[PDB]
Amino acid sequence: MLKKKQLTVLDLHPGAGKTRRVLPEIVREAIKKRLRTVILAPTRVVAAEMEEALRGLPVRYMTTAVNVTHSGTEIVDLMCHATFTSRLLQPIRVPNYNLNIMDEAHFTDPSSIAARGYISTRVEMGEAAAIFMTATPPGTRDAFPDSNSPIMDTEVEVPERAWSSGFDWVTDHSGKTVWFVPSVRNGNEIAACLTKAGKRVIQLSRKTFETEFQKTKNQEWDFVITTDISEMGANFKADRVIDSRRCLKPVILDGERVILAGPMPVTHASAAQRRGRIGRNPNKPGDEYMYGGGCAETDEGHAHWLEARMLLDNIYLQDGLIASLYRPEADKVAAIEGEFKLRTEQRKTFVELMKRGDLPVWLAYQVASAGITYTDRRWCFDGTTNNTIMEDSVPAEVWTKYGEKRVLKPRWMDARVCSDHAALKSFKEFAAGKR
Numbered sequence: 001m002l003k004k005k006q007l008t009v010l011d012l013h014p015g016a017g018k019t020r021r022v023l024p025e026i027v028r029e030a031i032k033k034r035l036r037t038v039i040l041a042p043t044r045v046v047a048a049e050m051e052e053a054l055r056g057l058p059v060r061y062m063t064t065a066v067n068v069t070h071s072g073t074e075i076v077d078l079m080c081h082a083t084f085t086s087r088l089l090q091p092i093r094v095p096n097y098n099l100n101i102m103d104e105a106h107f108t109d110p111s112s113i114a115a116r117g118y119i120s121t122r123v124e125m126g127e128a129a130a131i132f133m134t135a136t137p138p139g140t141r142d143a144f145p146d147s148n149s150p151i152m153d154t155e156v157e158v159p160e161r162a163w164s165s166g167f168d169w170v171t172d173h174s175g176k177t178v179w180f181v182p183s184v185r186n187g188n189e190i191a192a193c194l195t196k197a198g199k200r201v202i203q204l205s206r207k208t209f210e211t212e213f214q215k216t217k218n219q220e221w222d223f224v225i226t227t228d229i230s231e232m233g234a235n236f237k238a239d240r241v242i243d244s245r246r247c248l249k250p251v252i253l254d255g256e257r258v259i260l261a262g263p264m265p266v267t268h269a270s271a272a273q274r275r276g277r278i279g280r281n282p283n284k285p286g287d288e289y290m291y292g293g294g295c296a297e298t299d300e301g302h303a304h305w306l307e308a309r310m311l312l313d314n315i316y317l318q319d320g321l322i323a324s325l326y327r328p329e330a331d332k333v334a335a336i337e338g339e340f341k342l343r344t345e346q347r348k349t350f351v352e353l354m355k356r357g358d359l360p361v362w363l364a365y366q367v368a369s370a371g372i373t374y375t376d377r378r379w380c381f382d383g384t385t386n387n388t389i390m391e392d393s394v395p396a397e398v399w400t401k402y403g404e405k406r407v408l409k410p411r412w413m414d415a416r417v418c419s420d421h422a423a424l425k426s427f428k429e430f431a432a433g434k435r
Protein backbone atom coordinates (compact mmCIF):
# COMPACT_ATOMS: atom_id res chain seq x y z
CA MET A 1 0.00 0.00 0.00
CA LEU A 2 2.96 2.34 0.72
CA LYS A 3 4.20 2.72 -2.92
CA LYS A 4 3.75 6.06 -4.77
CA LYS A 5 0.68 6.80 -7.03
CA GLN A 6 -1.45 4.37 -4.92
CA LEU A 7 -4.55 5.28 -2.87
CA THR A 8 -5.99 2.40 -0.82
CA VAL A 9 -9.49 2.43 0.68
CA LEU A 10 -9.28 0.29 3.85
CA ASP A 11 -12.98 -0.57 4.18
CA LEU A 12 -13.08 -3.14 7.03
CA HIS A 13 -16.50 -3.16 8.87
CA PRO A 14 -16.99 -0.93 12.01
CA GLY A 15 -15.03 -2.35 14.95
CA ALA A 16 -12.88 -4.65 12.75
CA GLY A 17 -9.67 -3.13 14.24
CA LYS A 18 -8.53 -0.52 11.70
CA THR A 19 -7.22 1.87 14.39
CA ARG A 20 -5.86 -0.43 17.17
CA ARG A 21 -4.54 -3.26 14.93
CA VAL A 22 -4.07 -2.16 11.28
CA LEU A 23 -2.80 1.44 11.83
CA PRO A 24 0.28 0.45 14.06
CA GLU A 25 1.36 -2.22 11.50
CA ILE A 26 1.27 0.46 8.70
CA VAL A 27 3.21 2.97 10.86
CA ARG A 28 5.94 0.39 11.68
CA GLU A 29 6.40 -0.40 7.96
CA ALA A 30 6.46 3.36 7.05
CA ILE A 31 9.16 4.06 9.70
CA LYS A 32 11.20 1.05 8.35
CA LYS A 33 11.02 2.51 4.80
CA ARG A 34 11.80 6.12 5.91
CA LEU A 35 8.52 7.45 4.52
CA ARG A 36 7.66 10.94 5.83
CA THR A 37 4.11 10.15 7.13
CA VAL A 38 1.01 12.09 8.29
CA ILE A 39 -1.84 10.53 10.35
CA LEU A 40 -5.07 12.56 10.23
CA ALA A 41 -7.57 12.20 13.15
CA PRO A 42 -11.16 13.64 12.88
CA THR A 43 -11.30 14.83 16.54
CA ARG A 44 -8.99 15.34 19.56
CA VAL A 45 -10.80 12.34 21.23
CA VAL A 46 -9.74 10.00 18.35
CA ALA A 47 -6.20 11.51 18.54
CA ALA A 48 -6.01 10.42 22.24
CA GLU A 49 -7.10 6.87 21.34
CA MET A 50 -4.45 6.81 18.57
CA GLU A 51 -1.67 7.72 21.04
CA GLU A 52 -2.71 4.70 23.16
CA ALA A 53 -2.60 2.39 20.10
CA LEU A 54 0.73 3.83 18.84
CA ARG A 55 2.50 3.91 22.26
CA GLY A 56 6.24 3.23 22.00
CA LEU A 57 6.38 4.21 18.31
CA PRO A 58 8.07 7.52 17.42
CA VAL A 59 5.14 9.84 16.57
CA ARG A 60 5.12 13.69 16.77
CA TYR A 61 1.65 14.70 18.11
CA MET A 62 0.78 18.14 16.75
CA THR A 63 -2.04 18.68 19.30
CA THR A 64 -2.40 19.71 22.99
CA ALA A 65 -4.90 16.82 23.56
CA VAL A 66 -1.85 14.51 24.08
CA ASN A 67 0.78 15.23 26.78
CA VAL A 68 4.04 13.82 25.37
CA THR A 69 7.67 14.97 25.30
CA HIS A 70 8.96 14.44 21.74
CA SER A 71 12.51 13.26 20.90
CA GLY A 72 12.82 15.56 17.85
CA THR A 73 13.70 12.61 15.56
CA GLU A 74 10.15 11.63 14.52
CA ILE A 75 9.25 11.21 10.80
CA VAL A 76 5.52 10.48 11.58
CA ASP A 77 3.26 13.46 12.38
CA LEU A 78 -0.25 13.22 13.84
CA MET A 79 -2.80 16.04 13.59
CA CYS A 80 -6.57 16.64 13.18
CA HIS A 81 -8.19 16.82 9.63
CA ALA A 82 -8.94 20.58 10.29
CA THR A 83 -5.34 21.34 11.42
CA PHE A 84 -3.92 19.85 8.17
CA THR A 85 -6.23 22.02 5.96
CA SER A 86 -5.65 25.13 8.08
CA ARG A 87 -1.83 24.82 7.89
CA LEU A 88 -2.10 24.36 4.07
CA LEU A 89 -4.08 27.68 3.83
CA GLN A 90 -1.75 29.63 6.18
CA PRO A 91 1.74 30.79 5.01
CA ILE A 92 3.38 28.05 7.16
CA ARG A 93 5.56 25.36 5.49
CA VAL A 94 3.87 21.92 5.35
CA PRO A 95 6.09 18.93 4.45
CA ASN A 96 5.33 17.04 1.23
CA TYR A 97 4.32 13.76 2.99
CA ASN A 98 5.25 10.50 1.13
CA LEU A 99 2.45 8.58 3.00
CA ASN A 100 -0.92 10.22 3.96
CA ILE A 101 -3.16 8.17 6.34
CA MET A 102 -6.71 9.49 6.99
CA ASP A 103 -8.68 7.80 9.82
CA GLU A 104 -12.58 8.07 9.78
CA ALA A 105 -12.26 9.24 6.17
CA HIS A 106 -16.08 9.48 5.76
CA PHE A 107 -16.16 12.85 7.72
CA THR A 108 -18.17 15.41 5.64
CA ASP A 109 -17.07 18.69 7.32
CA PRO A 110 -15.62 21.14 4.70
CA SER A 111 -12.01 20.84 5.99
CA SER A 112 -12.13 16.99 5.74
CA ILE A 113 -13.51 16.97 2.14
CA ALA A 114 -10.74 19.55 1.24
CA ALA A 115 -7.97 17.37 2.82
CA ARG A 116 -9.25 14.30 0.77
CA GLY A 117 -9.18 16.42 -2.40
CA TYR A 118 -5.65 17.73 -1.78
CA ILE A 119 -4.22 14.26 -0.88
CA SER A 120 -5.94 12.32 -3.74
CA THR A 121 -4.68 14.95 -6.25
CA ARG A 122 -1.05 14.52 -5.07
CA VAL A 123 -1.53 10.72 -5.44
CA GLU A 124 -3.00 11.15 -8.99
CA MET A 125 0.03 13.34 -9.88
CA GLY A 126 2.37 10.47 -8.81
CA GLU A 127 3.90 12.31 -5.85
CA ALA A 128 2.52 10.39 -2.88
CA ALA A 129 0.70 7.29 -1.46
CA ALA A 130 -2.50 7.45 0.68
CA ILE A 131 -4.66 5.22 2.89
CA PHE A 132 -8.32 6.25 3.60
CA MET A 133 -9.65 4.33 6.63
CA THR A 134 -13.48 4.00 6.82
CA ALA A 135 -16.16 1.32 6.80
CA THR A 136 -18.37 3.69 4.67
CA PRO A 137 -16.56 5.12 1.62
CA PRO A 138 -18.30 7.86 -0.47
CA GLY A 139 -21.40 6.58 -2.25
CA THR A 140 -22.04 3.49 -0.08
CA ARG A 141 -25.60 2.15 -0.43
CA ASP A 142 -25.58 -0.37 2.47
CA ALA A 143 -26.86 1.00 5.80
CA PHE A 144 -26.63 -2.49 7.51
CA PRO A 145 -22.97 -3.66 7.18
CA ASP A 146 -21.29 -6.52 9.15
CA SER A 147 -20.43 -6.26 12.88
CA ASN A 148 -18.44 -8.10 15.65
CA SER A 149 -21.71 -9.53 17.06
CA PRO A 150 -25.33 -9.78 15.74
CA ILE A 151 -27.57 -6.69 15.97
CA MET A 152 -31.42 -6.66 16.21
CA ASP A 153 -32.55 -4.09 13.55
CA THR A 154 -36.06 -2.58 14.09
CA GLU A 155 -37.88 0.00 11.94
CA VAL A 156 -39.97 2.00 14.45
CA GLU A 157 -41.55 5.50 14.94
CA VAL A 158 -39.06 7.59 16.95
CA PRO A 159 -40.17 10.69 18.90
CA GLU A 160 -38.67 14.02 17.78
CA ARG A 161 -40.54 16.15 20.44
CA ALA A 162 -41.46 15.61 24.14
CA TRP A 163 -44.08 12.85 24.64
CA SER A 164 -46.53 11.69 27.32
CA SER A 165 -47.64 8.33 25.86
CA GLY A 166 -47.20 5.91 22.93
CA PHE A 167 -43.42 5.26 23.23
CA ASP A 168 -43.12 2.98 26.36
CA TRP A 169 -40.25 0.98 24.72
CA VAL A 170 -37.95 4.04 24.97
CA THR A 171 -38.14 4.41 28.77
CA ASP A 172 -38.78 0.71 29.66
CA HIS A 173 -35.16 -0.19 28.68
CA SER A 174 -32.70 -0.95 31.51
CA GLY A 175 -29.40 -0.47 29.64
CA LYS A 176 -27.49 2.42 28.03
CA THR A 177 -28.77 4.15 24.86
CA VAL A 178 -27.11 6.49 22.32
CA TRP A 179 -29.80 8.56 20.53
CA PHE A 180 -29.00 10.49 17.31
CA VAL A 181 -31.03 13.68 16.84
CA PRO A 182 -31.06 16.12 13.85
CA SER A 183 -30.11 19.28 15.88
CA VAL A 184 -28.94 20.69 19.29
CA ARG A 185 -32.41 22.35 19.83
CA ASN A 186 -34.21 19.02 19.14
CA GLY A 187 -31.87 17.18 21.51
CA ASN A 188 -32.62 19.78 24.27
CA GLU A 189 -36.40 18.96 24.14
CA ILE A 190 -35.88 15.15 24.18
CA ALA A 191 -33.24 15.43 26.95
CA ALA A 192 -35.66 17.51 29.09
CA CYS A 193 -38.43 14.90 28.60
CA LEU A 194 -36.05 12.03 29.61
CA THR A 195 -34.70 13.97 32.62
CA LYS A 196 -38.32 14.61 33.81
CA ALA A 197 -38.91 10.80 33.61
CA GLY A 198 -35.93 10.14 35.94
CA LYS A 199 -33.18 9.39 33.38
CA ARG A 200 -29.54 10.60 33.60
CA VAL A 201 -28.80 12.31 30.28
CA ILE A 202 -25.54 13.62 28.68
CA GLN A 203 -25.69 15.80 25.51
CA LEU A 204 -22.99 15.97 22.75
CA SER A 205 -22.55 18.41 19.85
CA ARG A 206 -19.58 19.81 17.80
CA LYS A 207 -18.70 22.62 20.28
CA THR A 208 -19.10 20.62 23.51
CA PHE A 209 -17.73 17.24 22.25
CA GLU A 210 -14.27 16.91 24.01
CA THR A 211 -15.54 18.27 27.35
CA GLU A 212 -18.85 16.36 27.53
CA PHE A 213 -17.49 13.07 26.04
CA GLN A 214 -15.29 12.60 29.15
CA LYS A 215 -18.58 12.39 31.18
CA THR A 216 -19.50 9.14 29.36
CA LYS A 217 -16.39 7.61 31.11
CA ASN A 218 -16.45 9.60 34.45
CA GLN A 219 -20.15 9.18 35.43
CA GLU A 220 -23.19 6.86 35.27
CA TRP A 221 -25.68 7.55 32.49
CA ASP A 222 -28.83 6.13 30.90
CA PHE A 223 -28.94 8.16 27.63
CA VAL A 224 -26.51 10.08 25.42
CA ILE A 225 -28.29 12.58 23.12
CA THR A 226 -25.99 13.40 20.22
CA THR A 227 -25.83 15.17 16.87
CA ASP A 228 -24.04 13.52 13.84
CA ILE A 229 -20.51 14.24 15.39
CA SER A 230 -20.70 10.83 17.18
CA GLU A 231 -20.50 9.10 13.70
CA MET A 232 -16.69 9.86 13.70
CA GLY A 233 -15.17 7.15 15.91
CA ALA A 234 -16.90 7.97 19.25
CA ASN A 235 -16.95 4.75 21.29
CA PHE A 236 -19.61 4.01 23.89
CA LYS A 237 -20.24 1.04 26.24
CA ALA A 238 -23.94 0.95 25.20
CA ASP A 239 -26.48 -1.78 24.23
CA ARG A 240 -28.93 0.25 22.09
CA VAL A 241 -28.99 2.98 19.41
CA ILE A 242 -32.13 4.99 18.73
CA ASP A 243 -31.68 6.75 15.36
CA SER A 244 -34.18 9.35 14.13
CA ARG A 245 -32.44 8.84 10.66
CA ARG A 246 -32.72 12.64 10.18
CA CYS A 247 -30.28 15.54 9.88
CA LEU A 248 -30.20 19.24 8.96
CA LYS A 249 -28.70 20.29 5.63
CA PRO A 250 -27.10 23.74 4.94
CA VAL A 251 -28.34 24.94 1.51
CA ILE A 252 -27.14 27.99 -0.48
CA LEU A 253 -30.23 29.69 -2.02
CA ASP A 254 -29.84 31.99 -5.07
CA GLY A 255 -26.10 32.17 -4.24
CA GLU A 256 -26.95 34.88 -1.63
CA ARG A 257 -27.88 33.16 1.69
CA VAL A 258 -27.48 29.87 3.63
CA ILE A 259 -30.56 28.20 5.17
CA LEU A 260 -30.76 25.06 7.37
CA ALA A 261 -33.12 22.82 5.36
CA GLY A 262 -34.95 19.89 6.91
CA PRO A 263 -34.85 17.77 9.04
CA MET A 264 -34.34 15.33 6.16
CA PRO A 265 -33.02 11.72 5.70
CA VAL A 266 -29.40 10.90 6.43
CA THR A 267 -27.15 9.15 3.84
CA HIS A 268 -26.60 5.32 4.00
CA ALA A 269 -23.03 6.08 5.20
CA SER A 270 -24.37 8.11 8.20
CA ALA A 271 -27.01 5.45 9.05
CA ALA A 272 -24.37 2.69 9.00
CA GLN A 273 -21.97 4.78 11.17
CA ARG A 274 -24.77 5.54 13.74
CA ARG A 275 -25.76 1.83 13.80
CA GLY A 276 -22.01 0.99 14.07
CA ARG A 277 -21.78 2.38 17.65
CA ILE A 278 -23.30 -0.98 18.84
CA GLY A 279 -22.68 -4.68 18.05
CA ARG A 280 -18.94 -4.02 18.72
CA ASN A 281 -18.42 -6.64 21.51
CA PRO A 282 -18.29 -10.22 20.17
CA ASN A 283 -19.21 -11.54 23.65
CA LYS A 284 -22.46 -9.42 23.75
CA PRO A 285 -24.92 -10.40 21.00
CA GLY A 286 -28.29 -8.69 20.63
CA ASP A 287 -27.55 -4.94 20.84
CA GLU A 288 -30.59 -3.09 19.44
CA TYR A 289 -30.82 -0.55 16.58
CA MET A 290 -34.20 1.26 16.36
CA TYR A 291 -34.51 3.51 13.30
CA GLY A 292 -37.30 6.02 12.51
CA GLY A 293 -36.95 6.70 8.77
CA GLY A 294 -35.28 5.78 5.49
CA CYS A 295 -32.00 6.91 3.84
CA ALA A 296 -31.45 9.21 0.87
CA GLU A 297 -28.45 10.84 -0.84
CA THR A 298 -28.84 14.21 0.87
CA ASP A 299 -25.15 15.13 0.34
CA GLU A 300 -26.05 16.31 -3.23
CA GLY A 301 -26.30 20.09 -3.12
CA HIS A 302 -25.23 20.23 0.57
CA ALA A 303 -23.20 23.49 1.16
CA HIS A 304 -20.18 21.64 2.71
CA TRP A 305 -19.06 20.43 -0.79
CA LEU A 306 -19.16 24.02 -2.20
CA GLU A 307 -17.28 25.23 0.96
CA ALA A 308 -14.59 22.52 0.32
CA ARG A 309 -14.04 24.00 -3.21
CA MET A 310 -13.67 27.54 -1.66
CA LEU A 311 -10.91 26.06 0.57
CA LEU A 312 -9.15 24.09 -2.32
CA ASP A 313 -9.18 27.15 -4.65
CA ASN A 314 -7.09 29.00 -2.03
CA ILE A 315 -4.47 26.26 -1.42
CA TYR A 316 -1.18 26.33 -3.37
CA LEU A 317 -0.49 23.04 -5.14
CA GLN A 318 1.87 23.80 -8.09
CA ASP A 319 1.98 27.11 -10.06
CA GLY A 320 -1.66 27.85 -11.21
CA LEU A 321 -2.94 24.26 -10.63
CA ILE A 322 -5.79 23.65 -8.21
CA ALA A 323 -6.59 20.40 -6.37
CA SER A 324 -9.77 18.60 -7.43
CA LEU A 325 -12.19 16.91 -4.99
CA TYR A 326 -11.75 13.15 -4.36
CA ARG A 327 -13.37 11.52 -7.47
CA PRO A 328 -16.22 9.51 -5.64
CA GLU A 329 -17.46 12.76 -4.01
CA ALA A 330 -16.70 15.33 -6.79
CA ASP A 331 -20.27 15.39 -8.27
CA LYS A 332 -21.91 16.56 -5.02
CA VAL A 333 -21.36 20.21 -6.04
CA ALA A 334 -21.84 22.13 -9.31
CA ALA A 335 -18.65 24.26 -9.25
CA ILE A 336 -15.97 25.65 -11.55
CA GLU A 337 -12.40 24.88 -10.29
CA GLY A 338 -10.66 28.18 -9.52
CA GLU A 339 -13.84 30.34 -9.34
CA PHE A 340 -13.20 31.03 -5.59
CA LYS A 341 -9.48 31.89 -5.96
CA LEU A 342 -8.70 35.08 -3.98
CA ARG A 343 -5.83 37.57 -4.29
CA THR A 344 -3.14 37.44 -1.51
CA GLU A 345 -4.71 40.14 0.74
CA GLN A 346 -8.38 38.97 0.47
CA ARG A 347 -7.17 35.38 1.08
CA LYS A 348 -5.54 36.44 4.37
CA THR A 349 -8.84 38.15 5.39
CA PHE A 350 -10.72 34.86 4.39
CA VAL A 351 -8.38 32.79 6.63
CA GLU A 352 -8.59 35.18 9.61
CA LEU A 353 -12.47 35.29 9.43
CA MET A 354 -12.51 31.45 9.67
CA LYS A 355 -9.68 30.96 12.17
CA ARG A 356 -10.15 33.93 14.55
CA GLY A 357 -13.71 35.00 13.56
CA ASP A 358 -14.92 31.34 13.77
CA LEU A 359 -17.36 32.08 10.89
CA PRO A 360 -18.66 29.40 8.46
CA VAL A 361 -16.55 29.02 5.26
CA TRP A 362 -19.31 30.42 2.93
CA LEU A 363 -19.90 33.51 5.14
CA ALA A 364 -16.11 34.19 5.48
CA TYR A 365 -15.89 34.06 1.65
CA GLN A 366 -18.69 36.65 1.03
CA VAL A 367 -17.02 39.13 3.48
CA ALA A 368 -13.39 38.70 2.18
CA SER A 369 -14.35 38.77 -1.59
CA ALA A 370 -16.29 42.04 -1.04
CA GLY A 371 -12.97 43.79 -0.10
CA ILE A 372 -13.90 44.13 3.60
CA THR A 373 -11.07 43.96 6.21
CA TYR A 374 -11.21 41.52 9.17
CA THR A 375 -12.00 44.13 11.95
CA ASP A 376 -14.60 46.08 9.92
CA ARG A 377 -18.04 44.91 11.23
CA ARG A 378 -20.29 47.48 9.54
CA TRP A 379 -21.67 44.59 7.33
CA CYS A 380 -23.24 42.94 10.51
CA PHE A 381 -25.82 45.83 10.65
CA ASP A 382 -26.48 47.00 7.05
CA GLY A 383 -28.47 44.13 5.50
CA THR A 384 -32.10 44.13 4.28
CA THR A 385 -34.93 44.01 6.90
CA ASN A 386 -35.57 40.31 6.05
CA ASN A 387 -31.99 39.51 7.26
CA THR A 388 -32.88 40.61 10.86
CA ILE A 389 -31.79 37.90 13.34
CA MET A 390 -34.42 37.01 15.95
CA GLU A 391 -33.74 36.02 19.57
CA ASP A 392 -36.70 34.93 21.77
CA SER A 393 -39.23 36.20 19.13
CA VAL A 394 -37.77 39.77 19.14
CA PRO A 395 -34.83 41.22 17.04
CA ALA A 396 -31.38 40.41 18.49
CA GLU A 397 -29.46 43.54 19.63
CA VAL A 398 -25.78 44.35 20.31
CA TRP A 399 -23.64 47.29 21.45
CA THR A 400 -21.36 48.12 18.54
CA LYS A 401 -17.62 48.83 19.07
CA TYR A 402 -18.66 52.57 18.79
CA GLY A 403 -20.96 52.23 21.87
CA GLU A 404 -24.20 52.35 19.84
CA LYS A 405 -27.09 49.84 20.37
CA ARG A 406 -28.07 48.28 17.02
CA VAL A 407 -30.27 45.53 15.63
CA LEU A 408 -28.28 42.52 14.24
CA LYS A 409 -29.03 42.55 10.47
CA PRO A 410 -26.12 41.04 8.45
CA ARG A 411 -25.56 41.92 4.74
CA TRP A 412 -25.13 38.09 4.16
CA MET A 413 -27.36 35.75 6.11
CA ASP A 414 -26.07 32.33 7.11
CA ALA A 415 -28.44 30.28 9.38
CA ARG A 416 -25.47 28.59 11.08
CA VAL A 417 -24.51 31.79 13.01
CA CYS A 418 -27.80 31.54 14.98
CA SER A 419 -28.80 27.82 14.86
CA ASP A 420 -28.69 27.55 18.71
CA HIS A 421 -28.08 29.75 21.84
CA ALA A 422 -24.27 29.19 21.82
CA ALA A 423 -23.92 30.03 18.08
CA LEU A 424 -25.92 33.35 18.31
CA LYS A 425 -23.99 34.36 21.50
CA SER A 426 -20.66 33.94 19.59
CA PHE A 427 -21.98 35.86 16.52
CA LYS A 428 -23.13 38.76 18.78
CA GLU A 429 -19.59 38.95 20.26
CA PHE A 430 -18.17 39.09 16.66
CA ALA A 431 -20.61 41.86 15.54
CA ALA A 432 -19.66 43.82 18.71
CA GLY A 433 -15.91 43.69 17.77
CA LYS A 434 -14.94 41.41 20.69
CA ARG A 435 -12.71 39.06 18.58
Ligand SMILES: c1ccc2sc(N3CCNCC3)nc2c1
Nearest residue numbers: 060061062063064065070079083
Ligand atom coordinates in the same frame (compact mmCIF):
# COMPACT_ATOMS: atom_id res chain seq x y z
C1 LIG B 1 5.30 19.88 17.19
C2 LIG B 1 5.63 20.51 15.97
C3 LIG B 1 4.75 21.38 15.38
C4 LIG B 1 3.52 21.68 16.00
S1 LIG B 1 2.25 22.64 15.59
C5 LIG B 1 1.27 22.31 16.94
N1 LIG B 1 -0.06 22.85 17.18
C6 LIG B 1 -0.79 23.68 16.15
C7 LIG B 1 -2.31 23.62 16.20
N2 LIG B 1 -2.81 22.56 17.00
C8 LIG B 1 -2.34 22.58 18.33
C9 LIG B 1 -0.81 22.56 18.45
N3 LIG B 1 1.90 21.41 17.76
C10 LIG B 1 3.20 21.06 17.20
C11 LIG B 1 4.08 20.17 17.80
